[PDB]
Amino acid sequence: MLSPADKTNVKAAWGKVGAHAGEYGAEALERMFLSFPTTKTYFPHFDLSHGSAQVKGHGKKVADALTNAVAHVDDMPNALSALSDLHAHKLAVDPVNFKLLSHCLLVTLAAHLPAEFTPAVHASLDKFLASVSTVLTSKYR
Amino acid sequence: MLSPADKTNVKAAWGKVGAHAGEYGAEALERMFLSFPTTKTYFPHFDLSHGSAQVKGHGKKVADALTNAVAHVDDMPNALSALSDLHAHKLAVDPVNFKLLSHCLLVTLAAHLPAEFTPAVHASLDKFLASVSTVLTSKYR
Amino acid sequence: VHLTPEEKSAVTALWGKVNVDEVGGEALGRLLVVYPWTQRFFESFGDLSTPDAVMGNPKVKAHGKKVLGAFSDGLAHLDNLKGTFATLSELHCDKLHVDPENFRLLGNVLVCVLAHHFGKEFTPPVQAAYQKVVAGVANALAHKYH
Amino acid sequence: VHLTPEEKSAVTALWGKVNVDEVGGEALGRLLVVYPWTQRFFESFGDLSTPDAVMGNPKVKAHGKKVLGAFSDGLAHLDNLKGTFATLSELHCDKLHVDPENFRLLGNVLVCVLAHHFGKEFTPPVQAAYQKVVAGVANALAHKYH
Numbered sequence: 001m002l003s004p005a006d007k008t009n010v011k012a013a014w015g016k017v018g019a020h021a022g023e024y025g026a027e028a029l030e031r032m033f034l035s036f037p038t039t040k041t042y043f044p045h046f047d048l049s050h051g052s053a054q055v056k057g058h059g060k061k062v063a064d065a066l067t068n069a070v071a072h073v074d075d076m077p078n079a080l081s082a083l084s085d086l087h088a089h090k091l092a093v094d095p096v097n098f099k100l101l102s103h104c105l106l107v108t109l110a111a112h113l114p115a116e117f118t119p120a121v122h123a124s125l126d127k128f129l130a131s132v133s134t135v136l137t138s139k140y141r
Numbered sequence: 142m143l144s145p146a147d148k149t150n151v152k153a154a155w156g157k158v159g160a161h162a163g164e165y166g167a168e169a170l171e172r173m174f175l176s177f178p179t180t181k182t183y184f185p186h187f188d189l190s191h192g193s194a195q196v197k198g199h200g201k202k203v204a205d206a207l208t209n210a211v212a213h214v215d216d217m218p219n220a221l222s223a224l225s226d227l228h229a230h231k232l233a234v235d236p237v238n239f240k241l242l243s244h245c246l247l248v249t250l251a252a253h254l255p256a257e258f259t260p261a262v263h264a265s266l267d268k269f270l271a272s273v274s275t276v277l278t279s280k281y282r
Numbered sequence: 283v284h285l286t287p288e289e290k291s292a293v294t295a296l297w298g299k300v301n302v303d304e305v306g307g308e309a310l311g312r313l314l315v316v317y318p319w320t321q322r323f324f325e326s327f328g329d330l331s332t333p334d335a336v337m338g339n340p341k342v343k344a345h346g347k348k349v350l351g352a353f354s355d356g357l358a359h360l361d362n363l364k365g366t367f368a369t370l371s372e373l374h375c376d377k378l379h380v381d382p383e384n385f386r387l388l389g390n391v392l393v394c395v396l397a398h399h400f401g402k403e404f405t406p407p408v409q410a411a412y413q414k415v416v417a418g419v420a421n422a423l424a425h426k427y428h
Numbered sequence: 429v430h431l432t433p434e435e436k437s438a439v440t441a442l443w444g445k446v447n448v449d450e451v452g453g454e455a456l457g458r459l460l461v462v463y464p465w466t467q468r469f470f471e472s473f474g475d476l477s478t479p480d481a482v483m484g485n486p487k488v489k490a491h492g493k494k495v496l497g498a499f500s501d502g503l504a505h506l507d508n509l510k511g512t513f514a515t516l517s518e519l520h521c522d523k524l525h526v527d528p529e530n531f532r533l534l535g536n537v538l539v540c541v542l543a544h545h546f547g548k549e550f551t552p553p554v555q556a557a558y559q560k561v562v563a564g565v566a567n568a569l570a571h572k573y574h
């Protein structure tokens with residue numbers, strides 16, 4: 001469960017991301033694909049080379065979904081409903097992969113937001129991504 | 142989320158366990174310690190030899206908590222609040238370990254309840270144990 | 283893998299009593315029922331909408347037999363799982379695109395099926411040995427992923 | 429630890445810019461703040477009740493230095509991590525009773541700290557090499573558990 005403090009921390013850090021969100025999403029994916037190669041099995045139809053348009057395109061979609069979750073932080077299960085259905089019924093993403101992406105997103109944010117990535121913010125962000133992962137995984141069975 | 146069929150499935154299965162719950166809890170622990178030695182780090186104060194009285198006693202307590210959860214399947218967070226508090230503030234059990242014990246409980250049930258351990262009941266029991274695990278780690282942070 | 287001689291013989295002895303046909307069909311079927319999303323890998327197998335349909339599906343049964351046959355051949359090469367499963371690793375990664383985490387799930391389902399079938403005979407020490415085997419097979423099948 | 433020479437040079441080059449004492453304190457501190465149940469291994473360290481109490485705790489800072497000093501020493505022995513960490517592995521199992529999953533968590537927190545400190549310079553390829561290293565150290569530290 002996110003606390004009032006967690007919510008504040010996440011809105012603030014994500015606020016600073018702003019219109020870099022799509023770029024950071026794409027970096028998070030590249031970081032994931034390189035550090036954890038098994039995650040590439042879900043994207044056999046993508047060109048995964050550095051700077052790929054499919055990567056950039058997907059990174060934006062992931063980033064927009066996170067932005068929408070932050071915008072609806074008090075109603076995430078409903079705000080992410082459509083996405084939760086999609087992942088459960090059309091994709092077969094093993095839950096551990098969400099942990100891998102979440103980690104890579106933290107690394108990316110740390111790499112770009114030195115002043116905002118404090119210990120308490122790092123903690124709130126990890127809780128936030130864990131909550132998002134839970135929602136997206138909630139209709140699996 | 143547990144469906145009505147899962148709830149029925151779990152109540153039936155657990156009902157047959159009956160008076161052997163304590164024995165099965167102890168067996169599941171023994172299986173866990175042998176299969177996954179890292180789990181032993183949480184019990185440095187126990188004699189973990191085969192048949193030791195601490196494992197028997199702990200097995201009963203685990204089993205009784207599960208019995209409690211089955212009876213309060215529609216209201217688990219409330220029924221297990223105290224245990225949730227205990228694991229979050231007094232113990233340091235890494236979440237992965239709940240999956241290990243959950244697997245060992247299923248193995249113990251399969252070994253003892255061959256007629257009742259159908260594929261549908263296996264699915265329900267796995268979901269139920271995952272729900273209990275979720276509740277027990279819900280107050281970690 | 284690091285298997286003790288009493289462990290090696292415990293595995294081998296039990297396996298000699300295994301009906302690979304039945305166990306293979308049961309293991310793969312249970313995987314598909316307990317973890318429904320894995321059905322995405324088997325779209326061409328037909329009706330998998332209910333557990334009964336899954337368990338009765340001849341394609342599920344035939345493929346379970348094939349999987350466990352490979353597994354079975356691996357048990358005769360415990361000292362070299364990596365070399366035995368190399369081509370199978372490449373295939374799972376390059377043609378099939380299967381997340382290796384699924385190999386771990388099938389492995390544990392397999393352990394549950396063995397327990398279901400052998401009851402008493404599937405003691406905690408026998409289980410421990412099989413957990414090492416199942417993890418070694420998983421790791422071997424994941425080895426050539428890139 | 430299978431590390432390409434170009435990976436090994438990437439790791440070493442960066443590590444040469446690290447202030448181990450400072451990074452050690454930050455990494456251990458963030459572990460205790462981000463995963464608060466790990467405070468149960470350090471009840472003798474005094475006040476860990478808020479983020480500033482943890483990050484500024486002199487015992488946390490001193491312990492972080494000890495931890496990362498042993499880590500660096502591992503970086504000089506990448507071809508024999510198991511040997512380098514044997515006695516520490518035994519100690520963490522038999523005396524401290526630390527679940528090895530915590531070594532993986534610390535490794536990931538260290539990676540975040542590196543990213544935080546180096547920014548752009550911590551490129552995706554560099555990170556990938558550090559991920560192999562931290563997994564290799566965790567595996568080495570877990571290897572004597574029994």
Ligand code: HEM
Nearest residue numbers: 039042043061062065066083086091093097098101132133
């Ligand atoms: C932070 C958690 C994640 C979020 C918010 C997220 C969000 C999204 C979004 C918005 C889409 C696009 C659906 C559409 O076009 O309408 C999508 C699709 C997809 N996601 Fe997830 N995702 C997450 C994690 C993951 C992970 C961990 C994996 C597996 C490694 C994954 C694999 C996929 C795949 C394969 C698609 C379909 C891509 C395509 O065919 O174009 N996602 N996701």
Ligand code: HEM
Nearest residue numbers: 180183184202203206207224232234238239242273274277
């Ligand atoms: C199915 C999930 C679990 C349930 C329902 C459960 C339930 C319980 C119960 C009822 C107690 C006794 C509390 C008391 O006496 O007041 C307990 C304590 C404890 N649990 Fe959990 N437990 C679960 C999983 C685990 C996991 C996986 C571990 C770690 C491997 C663990 C570690 C412990 C420890 C070390 C104690 C204290 C034992 C003692 O000092 O006597 N538990 N748990």
Ligand code: HEM
Nearest residue numbers: 320323324345348349350352353370378380384385388419
């Ligand atoms: C013990 C672990 C496993 C072993 C030993 C194994 C082995 C095999 C073998 C021998 C084949 C036949 C390859 C061929 O036709 O040349 C195969 C095919 C296949 N396997 Fe695996 N497998 C394992 C686990 C899994 C898992 C967990 C999945 C996915 C959930 C999977 C998905 C597939 C698929 C989709 C095929 C192709 C089936 C078809 O032709 O339609 N396997 N496997």
Ligand code: HEM
Nearest residue numbers: 466469470494495496498499516524526530531534565569
């Ligand atoms: C990179 C991984 C780690 C390394 C290389 C490492 C290394 C060390 C070293 C060199 C010592 C001092 C040994 C002694 O007192 O003789 C130590 C002590 C200790 N470590 Fe680890 N450590 C690591 C991770 C962890 C983790 C993640 C935890 C728990 C979350 C932990 C818990 C402890 C504790 C409780 C002590 C004793 C502290 C005391 O003096 O009271 N360590 N470690």
